[PDB]
Design a protein around this motif. Structure first.
Motif, PDB file in Angstrom:
ATOM      1  N   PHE A 124      42.393  11.365   0.893  1.00 20.62           N
ATOM      2  CA  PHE A 124      41.399  12.558   0.927  1.00 20.62           C
ATOM      3  C   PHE A 124      42.137  13.839   0.695  1.00 20.62           C
ATOM      4  O   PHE A 124      42.403  14.552   1.669  1.00 20.62           O
ATOM      5  CB  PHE A 124      40.615  12.662   2.244  1.00 20.62           C
ATOM      6  CG  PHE A 124      39.359  13.560   1.696  1.00 20.62           C
ATOM      7  CD1 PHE A 124      38.359  12.567   1.191  1.00 20.62           C
ATOM      8  CD2 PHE A 124      39.294  14.741   1.936  1.00 20.62           C
ATOM      9  CE1 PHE A 124      37.016  13.288   0.722  1.00 20.62           C
ATOM     10  CE2 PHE A 124      38.092  15.451   1.496  1.00 20.62           C
ATOM     11  CZ  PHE A 124      37.089  14.731   1.162  1.00 20.62           C
ATOM     12  N   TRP A 127      39.972  19.191  -0.250  1.00 17.40           N
ATOM     13  CA  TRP A 127      39.397  19.773   0.836  1.00 17.40           C
ATOM     14  C   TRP A 127      38.233  20.830   0.617  1.00 17.40           C
ATOM     15  O   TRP A 127      37.757  21.547   1.506  1.00 17.40           O
ATOM     16  CB  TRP A 127      40.188  20.074   1.922  1.00 17.40           C
ATOM     17  CG  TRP A 127      40.889  18.927   2.624  1.00 17.40           C
ATOM     18  CD1 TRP A 127      41.697  17.882   2.080  1.00 17.40           C
ATOM     19  CD2 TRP A 127      40.675  18.640   3.931  1.00 17.40           C
ATOM     20  NE1 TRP A 127      42.157  17.161   2.762  1.00 17.40           N
ATOM     21  CE2 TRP A 127      41.231  17.324   3.880  1.00 17.40           C
ATOM     22  CE3 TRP A 127      39.790  19.035   4.867  1.00 17.40           C
ATOM     23  CZ2 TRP A 127      41.292  16.552   5.336  1.00 17.40           C
ATOM     24  CZ3 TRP A 127      39.649  18.191   6.070  1.00 17.40           C
ATOM     25  CH2 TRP A 127      40.416  17.101   6.343  1.00 17.40           C
ATOM     26  N   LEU A 151      32.209  21.579   2.270  1.00 29.26           N
ATOM     27  CA  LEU A 151      32.904  20.329   2.623  1.00 29.26           C
ATOM     28  C   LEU A 151      31.964  19.952   3.823  1.00 29.26           C
ATOM     29  O   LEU A 151      31.515  18.574   3.872  1.00 29.26           O
ATOM     30  CB  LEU A 151      34.049  20.488   3.095  1.00 29.26           C
ATOM     31  CG  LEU A 151      35.209  19.475   3.452  1.00 29.26           C
ATOM     32  CD1 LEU A 151      35.834  18.614   2.501  1.00 29.26           C
ATOM     33  CD2 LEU A 151      36.005  19.921   4.557  1.00 29.26           C
ATOM     34  N   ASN A 155      30.583  16.173   2.707  1.00 28.53           N
ATOM     35  CA  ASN A 155      31.388  15.134   3.121  1.00 28.53           C
ATOM     36  C   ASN A 155      31.268  14.670   4.575  1.00 28.53           C
ATOM     37  O   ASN A 155      31.611  13.704   4.982  1.00 28.53           O
ATOM     38  CB  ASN A 155      33.014  15.443   2.808  1.00 28.53           C
ATOM     39  CG  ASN A 155      33.202  15.704   1.395  1.00 28.53           C
ATOM     40  OD1 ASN A 155      32.911  16.676   0.756  1.00 28.53           O
ATOM     41  ND2 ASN A 155      33.433  14.593   0.707  1.00 28.53           N
ATOM     42  N   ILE A 208      34.523  11.352   4.367  1.00 22.50           N
ATOM     43  CA  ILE A 208      35.851  11.919   4.080  1.00 22.50           C
ATOM     44  C   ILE A 208      36.755  10.821   4.630  1.00 22.50           C
ATOM     45  O   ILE A 208      38.050  10.719   4.029  1.00 22.50           O
ATOM     46  CB  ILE A 208      36.279  12.951   5.216  1.00 22.50           C
ATOM     47  CG1 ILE A 208      34.820  13.665   5.694  1.00 22.50           C
ATOM     48  CG2 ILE A 208      37.100  14.151   4.752  1.00 22.50           C
ATOM     49  CD1 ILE A 208      35.000  13.123   6.987  1.00 22.50           C
ATOM     50  N   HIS A 234      29.372  10.225   8.221  1.00 25.99           N
ATOM     51  CA  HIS A 234      30.515  10.657   8.935  1.00 25.99           C
ATOM     52  C   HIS A 234      30.159  10.975  10.511  1.00 25.99           C
ATOM     53  O   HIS A 234      30.614  10.392  11.271  1.00 25.99           O
ATOM     54  CB  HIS A 234      31.446  11.899   8.575  1.00 25.99           C
ATOM     55  CG  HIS A 234      32.634  11.982   9.126  1.00 25.99           C
ATOM     56  ND1 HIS A 234      33.622  11.123   9.515  1.00 25.99           N
ATOM     57  CD2 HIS A 234      32.959  13.273   9.479  1.00 25.99           C
ATOM     58  CE1 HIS A 234      34.711  11.746  10.065  1.00 25.99           C
ATOM     59  NE2 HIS A 234      34.036  13.064  10.103  1.00 25.99           N
TER      60      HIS A 234
END
Ligand SMILES: N[C@@H](Cc1c[nH]c[nH+]1)C(=O)O
Ligand SMILES: N[C@@H](Cc1c[nH]c[nH+]1)C(=O)O
Lengths: 256, 256
Positions: A124, A127, A151, A155, A208, A234
């Motif tokens: 990853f 960013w 982000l 993500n 992520i 996530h």
């Protein structure tokens, strides 16, 4: 059984990411502590006054020091929370019944403490709109970061509601991975961190901590139990709160 | 029309109480600023460094100073947010299209700035488990407070979900009403604060700003528009978010 869960947020966040899971666990009869780590949540320090991941972990270490001889807690950490759990288990492995890793880094005892984090940066590397700054503390130049809003949306909070994402925009603070200090840090010990029961919880929908990274971690240092939550994103404690409470009820029933 | 709403939290809270309303207003096409006031939310100052309600209001005043000549905002304040609106309108009445009072104190121009707050303490004198402390700033002893968790559950967040209440437990900070400094403060002016259009939004289900207090305020200083939301509790932006967004769409359509 009923357990005492200590919920540990990731960098740039605070105890507030646990606002949905904490009521649920308590409704099942568990005690829950959700700490702000240094310079996180509504903790009054700024990240520039913190010089390492060990300094960052101070509210957790002081918490574990305050527990009376004989009681044990289940540490639950999300995303970089895995490193706070490795630092705390090297000092208080006797106070830890088990550590749950929730879409988390899983440090080991064979490679430097930064190893899993260096491997995340390879898998990853982009960013998006995250910004960086440097500061000096105890003669070390540290790279701090502030998570970008695109982000966070795409993500980390992919599938979370707009109001949960709003809290992330309003409450995320400047943090640091302290990566260069982590590298030179002594390795987590076998008798401390190595001896803790480790339960790994993850989803393949994580945008992520991608499946390649997470399955890589599972193969690098085998967890005692692995649970894969279907769906979610996530922030499983926000998109799959009930499922994580069930997994944590089952961890309380098995470990003490 | 589309307006620029500036959302102002009450004491001991932060921008985060607006995490539900802010997405909604933006989804209707409005710009929304939700400020942390000094020593509130994730603002880095502590309340002991603040010596007055005017010092407390600094993020809002600096915000209003930064707006380019010719643009206007609708100030929306909740609970003690009404006093920040009186302070800001005495300095920037030209930048304010209207102020919305949301289960808020409604200061006037005839009595000292503390008047409505002294009347709240008569109607609501039992603050349950709220704690107090004193500190000295610029030679004044100030009484600070930290809202009790049973007062938060029963009176302020009565009807809010356990996860919204959790955020209040995790995020509320030490604040102050600065009541004794408010008393000696010069009165809000007629040409500044007195000239602002004032829209009063309230529910009779509010458990701290009781109907007696709120109807008393309406009679003491008549608002330009009064809206009563049916149901809800004190935190209408959490229990009746859609209804408040509709009222705010209608305020944008009428004032500029
Ligand atoms: N905010 C990140 C924390 C982190 C940033 N980078 C690595 N870990 C998360 O929730 O995953
Ligand atoms: N937390 C309070 C703010 C306040 C305390 N006392 C008076 N006003 C509220 O939401 O009403």
């Amino acid at each position: 059984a009923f357990a005492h869960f200590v919920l540990i947020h990731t960098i740039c966040h605070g105890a507030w990411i646990w606002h949905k899971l904490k009521p649920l666990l308590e409704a099942l009869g568990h005690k829950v502590t959700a700490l702000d780590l240094a310079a996180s949540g509504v903790d009054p320090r700024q990240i520039e006054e913190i010089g390492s991941f060990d300094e960052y972990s101070e509210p957790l270490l002081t918490f574990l020091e305050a527990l009376p001889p004989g009681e044990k807690v289940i540490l639950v950490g999300e995303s970089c929370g895995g490193l706070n759990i490795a630092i705390a288990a090297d000092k208080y492995c006797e106070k830890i019944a088990a550590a749950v890793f929730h879409n988390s880094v899983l440090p080991d005892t064979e490679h430097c403490p930064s190893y899993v984090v260096d491997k995340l940066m390879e898998v990853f590397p982009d960013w998006k709109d995250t910004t960086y700054f440097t500061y000096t503390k105890d003669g070390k130049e540290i790279t701090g970061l502030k998570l970008g809003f695109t982000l966070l949306r795409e993500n980390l909070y992919t599938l979370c509601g707009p109001e949960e994402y709003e809290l992330a925009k309003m409450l995320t603070r400047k943090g640091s991975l302290f990566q260069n200090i982590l590298a030179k840090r002594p390795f987590f010990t076998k008798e401390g961190y190595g001896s803790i029961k480790k339960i790994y919880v993850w989803t393949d929908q994580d945008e992520i901590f991608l499946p390649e990274f997470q399955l890589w971690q599972i193969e690098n240092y085998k967890p005692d139990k692995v649970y894969k939550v279907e769906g979610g994103d996530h922030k499983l404690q926000l998109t799959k709160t009930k499922e994580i409470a069930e997994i944590l009820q089952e961890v309380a029933d098995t470990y003490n």
